[PDB]
C-alpha cells in the first residue's frame, strides 16, 4: 500500500527459511514507508529483490546482513529516521555479506538523510565504494556525534568512481551512482539545500533535500507529512473547547484523517497500539477503538507476554498459567515453547499439563501474537483456543508474525471462532500431521492485502485427502478448521449447538 511494518529479527536465523523470501515479498511489495526496521538477512545469491524498489523511508534502522545477493535495490530510499537503532547505535548496518557471492555495491542513490544513529559496515569482502561516501553529509545536523565504523577490508579489485562524479564520491561504478551532497554545500546556515546558491535553500520542515524552496517541495519531512505539506506537528483536533475541522491524527510520521484499522485513537490525537497509563480501550459500534481516561480507578485487565510484569517472560509456563484463568481478553501475547511443557529443572518449575490449558477456554481476544512451537502430544488440536475470535497482532513475533505454529503434532487447527487477524503474517511450517491448513479461509481472516499465510512442510494435501481427512459436506464453501460438522467456518444449512445440521 503506502506504509508497512518492518521486522525485529535482528541477526537471528529465519524461522522458516523455505518461505523467508516470501515473507519479505509480502511485507515490502509496493510499500513506500517502512514503519519499523528494514532487515534484509540470509538472502540467497540469486534472490529476486524487486519488491523493495518502492521504499523511500525507513523509520527504524536498515540492516543488510549475512546475504549472498550481489546487489540490494534500495536506490529510491531517501531517509532513515533512526527511531530504532541496531546495537543501540547504528541506523545503517551492513554486515557479513559474502561469481563470488556477497554485496558488491550499496547503491543507495537517494540516501541523503539519517536523522539518528550511525553507520556500521563490517566484513563485506566484495563491497566497494563504502569509504568514499561523505557520511557527514548524510547525517543530520543534530546527529553529527553518530559513530561511523566502516571496515575497508576487501577481497577484490575496486574500480575507480565514475568520471561524472565530480568529488569521486560514488555509490557504484555507474555514472548515475554519484553521491548528491545536500548539507555541506549550503550557503548560509541551511540544514539542507538543493544547490550552492542561497535561493536553493530548503524549507525548515524539509528533510533530505527539496525540489524547491516551499514546504510542499521537500523530498522528505523532518517531522510530519500532512498531505504533501511538511509540518512541525499535526493540526490539533481541538483549539482551546470546540472541534477543529482541519485537525488531524498523528500516525507514524504522517497526519491522517482517521487512525488506521488496528490502532487506537487518543484524546490528544495520537494513533497508538497500547493505551497510555490510566487509560482503557473503548470500542464503538463501527468498530473503531479509542483510548479514554478511566473515570473511576481502572478495572483490572489481563496481561500477556511482552506487557507489564510479563514483559521479559518468554513463554507461558506453569509459573504464570493461573494468571490467565477466566481471562476473556489478553493484553499481550501467548507463546508456547518446548520449555513450557518440558519444564525447567534449574528453576524447579513444573512442566505445563494439558488440563491447565483449559484456563484459555474463555479467551476471546489476543492483542499481541499467538506463537506455538510446542504442544502436548495427547492433544490433537488447538481446541483450548476454540473460543478465540481475534488475534490483533499489535505485537508481532519477530516483527512479522501474529500466528505461528511450528513443529507441532496437531492433526487439525480447530480454531473455530477465529475470524480476524488484525496485523502481521501467519506462519505454519513443519507440522507433520497437520491436514486442515488449506481448508481455512485465510483471506477472510486477513485485513490487509500485505497479510498472507506462509505454509511449508506440513502434511501433503493429496495425502490428507487420500486418508479421507477433509472438509465435511455440511461446511459451506469447503471452509473448515477440522474434521466433522463442529469445525465448519460457516454452516450451509442449520446450526444446533456448535454443530452444523440439515
Amino acid at each position, epitope marked *: 500500500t503506502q506504509v508497512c511494518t*518492518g521486522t525485529d529479527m535482528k541477526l537471528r536465523l529465519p524461522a522458516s527459511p523455505e518461505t523467508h523470501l516470501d515473507m519479505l515479498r509480502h511485507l515490502y511489495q509496493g510499500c513506500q514507508v517502512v*514503519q519499523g*526496521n528494514l532487515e534484509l538477512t540470509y538472502l540467497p545469491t540469486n534472490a529476486s529483490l524487486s519488491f523493495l524498489q518502492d521504499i523511500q523511508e525507513v523509520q527504524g534502522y536498515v540492516l543488510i546482513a549475512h546475504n549472498q545477493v550481489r546487489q540490494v535495490p534500495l536506490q529510491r530510499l531517501r531517509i532513515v529516521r533512526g527511531t530504532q537503532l541496531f546495537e*543501540d547505535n547504528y541506523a545503517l548496518a551492513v554486515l557479513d555479506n559474502g561469481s563470488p557471492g556477497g554485496l558488491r555495491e550499496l547503491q543507495l542513490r537517494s540516501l541523503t538523510e539519517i536523522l539518528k544513529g550511525g553507520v556500521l559496515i563490517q566484513r563485506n569482502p566484495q563491497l566497494c565504494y563504502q569509504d568514499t561516501i561523505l557520511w557527514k553529509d548524510i547525517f543530520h545536523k543534530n546527529n553529527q556525534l553518530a559513530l561511523t565504523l566502516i571496515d575497508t577490508n576487501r577481497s577484490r579489485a575496486c574500480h575507480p568512481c565514475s568520471p561524472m562524479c565530480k568529488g569521486s564520491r560514488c555509490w557504484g561504478e555507474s555514472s548515475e551512482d554519484c553521491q548528491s551532497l545536500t548539507r555541506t554545500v549550503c550557503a548560509g546556515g541551511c540544514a539542507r539545500c538543493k544547490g550552492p546558491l542561497p535561493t536553493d535553500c530548503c524549507h525548515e520542515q524539509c528533510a533530505a533535500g527539496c525540489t524547491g524552496p516551499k514546504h510542499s517541495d521537500c523530498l522528505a519531512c523532518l517531522h510530519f507529512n500532512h498531505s504533501g505539506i511538511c509540518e512541525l506537528h499535526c493540526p490539533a483536533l481541538v483549539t482551546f473547547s470546540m472541534p477543529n475541522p482541519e485537525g488531524r491524527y498523528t500516525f507514524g510520521a504522517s497526519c491522517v484523517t482517521a487512525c488506521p484499522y488496528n490502532y487506537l485513537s*487518543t484524546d490528544v490525537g495520537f494513533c*497508538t497500539l497500547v493505551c497510555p*497509563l490510566h487509560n482503557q480501550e473503548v470500542t464503538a459500534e463501527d468498530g473503531t477503538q479509542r483510548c479514554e481516561k478511566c473515570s473511576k480507578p481502572c478495572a483490572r485487565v489481563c496481561y500477556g507476554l511482552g506487557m507489564e510484569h510479563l*514483559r*521479559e517472560v518468554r513463554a507461558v509456563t506453569s509459573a504464570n498459567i493461573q494468571e490467565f484463568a477466566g481471562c476473556k481478553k489478553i493484553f499481550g501475547s501467548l507463546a508456547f515453547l518446548p520449555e513450557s511443557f518440558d519444564g525447567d529443572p534449574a528453576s524447579n518449575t513444573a512442566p505445563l499439563q494439558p488440563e491447565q490449558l483449559q484456563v484459555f477456554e474463555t479467551l476471546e481476544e489476543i492483542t499481541g501474537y499467538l506463537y506455538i512451537s510446542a504442544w502436548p502430544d495427547s492433544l490433537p488440536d488447538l481446541s483450548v483456543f476454540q473460543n478465540l475470535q481475534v488475534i490483533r497482532g499489535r505485537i508481532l513475533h519477530n516483527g512479522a508474525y501474529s500466528l505461528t505454529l511450528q513443529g507441532l503434532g496437531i492433526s487439525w487447527l480447530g480454531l473455530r471462532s477465529l475470524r480476524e487477524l488484525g496485523s502481521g503474517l501467519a506462519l505454519i511450517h513443519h507440522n507433520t500431521h497437520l491436514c486442515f491448513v488449506h481448508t481455512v479461509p485465510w483471506d477472510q481472516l486477513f485485513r490487509n492485502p500485505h497479510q498472507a499465510l506462509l505454509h511449508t512442510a506440513n502434511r501433503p494435501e493429496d495425502e490428507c485427502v487420500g486418508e479421507g481427512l477433509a472438509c465435511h459436506q455440511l461446511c459451506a464453501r469447503g471452509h473448515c478448521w477440522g474434521p466433522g460438522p463442529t469445525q465448519c467456518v460457516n454452516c450451509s444449512q442449520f446450526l444446533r449447538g456448535q454443530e452444523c445440521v440439515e
Partner: antibody
Amino acid sequence: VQLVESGGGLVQPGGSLRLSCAASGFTWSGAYIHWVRQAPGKGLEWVASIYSAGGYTDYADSVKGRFTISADTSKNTAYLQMNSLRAEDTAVYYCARYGTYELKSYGSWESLPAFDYWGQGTLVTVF
Amino acid sequence: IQMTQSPSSLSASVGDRVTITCRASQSVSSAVAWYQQKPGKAPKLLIYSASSLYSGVPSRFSGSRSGTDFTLTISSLQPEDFATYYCQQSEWGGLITFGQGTKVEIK
C-alpha cells in the same frame, strides 16, 4: 525540547509568587507539565501537574487550595502561582515533562510514563 | 506520602553490583520509574516502565519487579554512578509519588 524556568526568588510569608516554565511544543505533544519540589536536604516531592489537551490540573494534598497551575497555550508556557507560602514551601522547584509521546515500531505513538526532561530548577525561599 | 526505599544509604566500590528495592503501592508495572540525581543537578530518567531502559542510558542499569517490590540493579558500578536514586509511581487520579531516596557513597 528544553525546559526553561523563571520567576523564582525571595518571598514574604503569606505572599504570592509566580513560577514560569517554557516548554517546546507543550500543547501539541500531548504531555503533562509537572512541578516537583525538593526541600533542602530532603527528597523529591511532587507538587502539581497540568494536562496539555484540556488544561486539567492536579495538585498534591499539601499544596491543594494554595497553589494553582495554569497554562498559556498561545505562548506555550506553564505557570505555577503560589499563594500563602509557608516555611515548608522553601524548595528548589523543577518543572518536568511527563507522558510525552514517542514514535515506536509500526508507526505507533506511545506515551512515556515518566519524567524524561527536567528544568534546571529555581530556588524559592520563604522567610 | 513516600513509598519505602531500602537501603536508605549504600556504600560500595567501583565495579560492585548493587541493588535497591522500592516497596510501593500495588499497581501496573508501567507506573514505576527510576531516576538518578547528582547533587545540585536536576534528576535524569533511568528506567521508565520498571524494566525498560531509557534512551542514552547505559545497559548496566536494570529494572525488575517482584510483587509490590520494584528493584533497580547496577551490575557494574562506575565512578559516575554515585548519586541519589529515586523511585517514582503514578497512581490513578493524577497523583505522582516519589521514594525517599537511595544514596550510593564511594568507599
